[PDB]
Design a protein around this ligand. Structure first.
Ligand SMILES: *[C@@H]1O[C@H](CO)[C@@H](O[C@@H]2O[C@H](CO)[C@@H](O[C@@H]3O[C@H](CO[C@H]4O[C@H](CO)[C@@H](O)[C@H](O)[C@@H]4O[C@@H]4O[C@H](CO)[C@@H](O[C@@H]5O[C@H](CO)[C@H](O)[C@H](O)[C@H]5O)[C@H](O)[C@H]4NC(C)=O)[C@@H](O)[C@H](O[C@H]4O[C@H](CO)[C@@H](O)[C@H](O)[C@@H]4O[C@@H]4O[C@H](CO)[C@@H](O)[C@H](O)[C@@H]4O)[C@@H]3O)[C@H](O)[C@H]2NC(C)=O)[C@H](O)[C@H]1NC(C)=O
Ligand SMILES: *[C@@H]1O[C@H](CO)[C@@H](O[C@@H]2O[C@H](CO)[C@@H](O)[C@H](O)[C@H]2NC(C)=O)[C@H](O)[C@H]1NC(C)=O
Ligand SMILES: *[C@@H]1O[C@H](CO)[C@@H](O)[C@H](O)[C@H]1NC(C)=O
Ligand SMILES: *[C@@H]1O[C@H](CO)[C@@H](O)[C@H](O)[C@H]1NC(C)=O
Length: 417
């Protein structure tokens, strides 16, 4: 073969983007891949807190932080100066020993190969990345080749200048194809206009089978009482088995439900019966979570968990700006000269969107998500569909061997609307 970046060694691919940043001084590939995972999780939890804090406590939250990271790592390929430094610091890519910014993508390809280049039994875990550039412009060749080489991202030309809305529909349909119909409207209406230069897209799809499934015979319907609202119907599944469990500080229950193969698991964090999720969420760090996992012991238990689905869609502009990502979104100060032929400097991100889906039932779980960075479109207002319910719990879908948070969120409403 020409190249499988997966087997390749760091001194093989000539992965040399426009600008490089050196992180201040504060196997080697395998240890760096483990370091990338910690970065992603610190980004995950920190990002989670800002998102949580901007939403109602009784509303659902669901996302793929990995997706986001990937999408903005692709965006980082043509960044420069403070925009390059900001991307590095916000996604915690500057927490790895290797100071070079160009090295990050290499380990991200390693990480991605481990994740999605096995296709391991009863654990469909696939990912697709794509760049959608205006059809009249000329993209830097090095940028295109590296984006394809590292992220598997080809550049599909779309007429943004004359057919913006047709282009948006084309991108949403591409995302729909890669997520099995789960993600249908990543880009919201009017996000893409006539001046849109490029859209960077990531998508992840999961479908797992439970290692120990619930039987539909034992599933029963029961009334769920919303915050102040009325009641709704929720389908509660039941099962009795041996699960890795632990009740940590303050009556906080941590339960792990493995997927066939044991490489991918779902983790549930339920706050004490009366208490809220605010404390757990406020003190939520990667290290806290790792401590909890380390305290888990196998144990016979009865599991009552709902059969449900939750979708969540939002802009990421607010939260990332608050986290330190300011330059990228400013027309005036954004620096992305590695994308368009002739090192073009007037590009900035107008908005970035995320749409995630989660479905849990008797046979297993299925998740999907998509991130999309729009360069030079219109910046709109986050259309909030605040759906309040009660007594929420945390959900995490992780890859065990690779220390990776794929999906993450809060299920507050288990009813079927
Ligand atoms: C998104 O769009 C896609 C279309 O663009 C949709 O995909 C369509 O999905 C259906 C199934 O869901 C699929 O049917 C299968 O077709 C198989 C193979 O097609 C290939 O045909 C020859 C060889 O067979 C290839 O050379 C040819 O190019 C075909 O198509 C390409 O296939 C690749 C993958 O092989 C495609 O996908 C890419 O895959 C890569 C992975 O590296 C990555 O995930 C990409 O992201 C992904 O895009 C690519 O789209 C295709 N390229 C081109 C240029 O077209 C059949 O082999 C298969 O049939 C088996 O299954 C049935 C069902 O159970 C059995 O009954 C059959 O017998 C058969 O089983 C076999 O039986 C043998 C006995 O003879 C036995 O020995 C053997 O082991 C096996 O058991 C099945 O019919 C469509 O082909 C596919 N469309 C296209 C155009 O390919 C997708 O649904 C869309 N998603 C949404 C949500 O809309
Ligand atoms: C496309 O981007 C590549 C880098 O990703 C540019 O190539 C660089 O060219 C300048 C020459 O002045 C030097 O910095 C290096 O020789 C090249 N590589 C690196 C690592 O920077 C190339 O100029 C860009 N092409 C266009 C037309 O914009
Ligand atoms: C960053 O900006 C300065 C000027 O603002 C420029 O001279 C330099 O080439 C840029 N990139 C790096 C890697 O410093
Ligand atoms: C994972 O298990 C199934 C066995 O049929 C298959 O998809 C694949 O061969 C296995 N993955 C690897 C890494 O071999």
């Amino acid at each position: 073969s020409p190249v499988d970046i997966c087997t390749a060694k760091p001194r093989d691919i000539p992965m040399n983007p426009m600008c490089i940043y050196r992180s201040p001084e504060k196997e080697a590939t395998n240890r760096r891949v483990w370091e990338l995972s910690k970065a992603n999780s610190r980004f995950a939890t920190t990002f989670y807190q800002h998102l949580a804090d901007s939403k109602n406590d009784n509303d659902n939250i669901f996302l793929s932080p990995l997706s986001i990271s990937t999408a903005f790592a692709m965006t980082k390929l043509g960044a420069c100066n403070d925009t390059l430094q900001q991307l590095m610091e916000v996604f915690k890519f500057d927490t790895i020993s290797e100071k070079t910014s160009d090295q990050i993508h290499f380990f991200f390809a390693k990480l991605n190969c481990r994740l999605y280049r096995k296709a391991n039994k009863s654990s469909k875990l696939v990912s697709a990345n794509r760049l959608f550039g205006d059809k009249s412009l000329t993209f830097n060749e090095t940028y295109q080749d590296i984006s394809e080489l590292v992220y598997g991202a080809k550049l599909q030309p779309l007429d943004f200048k004359e057919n913006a809305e047709q282009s948006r529909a084309a991108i949403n349909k591409w995302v729909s194809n890669k997520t099995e119909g789960r993600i249908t409207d990543v880009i919201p209406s009017e996000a893409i206009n006539e001046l849109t230069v490029l859209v960077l897209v990531n998508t992840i799809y999961f479908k797992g089978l439970w290692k120990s499934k619930f039987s539909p015979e034992n599933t029963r319907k029961e009334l769920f009482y919303k915050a102040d609202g009325e009641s709704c119907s929720a389908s509660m599944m039941y099962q009795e088995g041996k699960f890795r469990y632990r009740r940590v500080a303050e009556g906080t229950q941590v339960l792990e439900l493995p997927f066939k193969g044991d490489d991918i698991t779902m983790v549930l964090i339920l706050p004490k019966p009366e208490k809220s999720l605010a404390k757990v969420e406020k003190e939520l760090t990667p290290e806290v979570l790792q401590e909890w996992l380390d305290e888990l012991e196998e144990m016979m238990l009865v599991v009552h968990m709902p059969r449900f689905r939750i979708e969540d869609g939002f802009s990421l502009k607010e939260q990332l700006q608050d986290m330190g990502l300011v330059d990228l979104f400013s027309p005036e100060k954004s620096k992305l000269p590695g994308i368009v032929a002739e090192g073009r400097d007037d590009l900035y991100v107008s908005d970035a969107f995320h749409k995630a889906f989660l479905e849990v039932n008797e046979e297993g779980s299925e998740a999907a998500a998509s991130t999309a960075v729009v360069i030079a479109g219109r910046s709109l207002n986050p259309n909030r569909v605040t759906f309040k319910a009660n007594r929420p719990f945390l959900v995490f879908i992780r890859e065990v061997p690779l220390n990776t948070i794929i999906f993450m969120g809060r299920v507050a409403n288990p009813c079927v609307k």
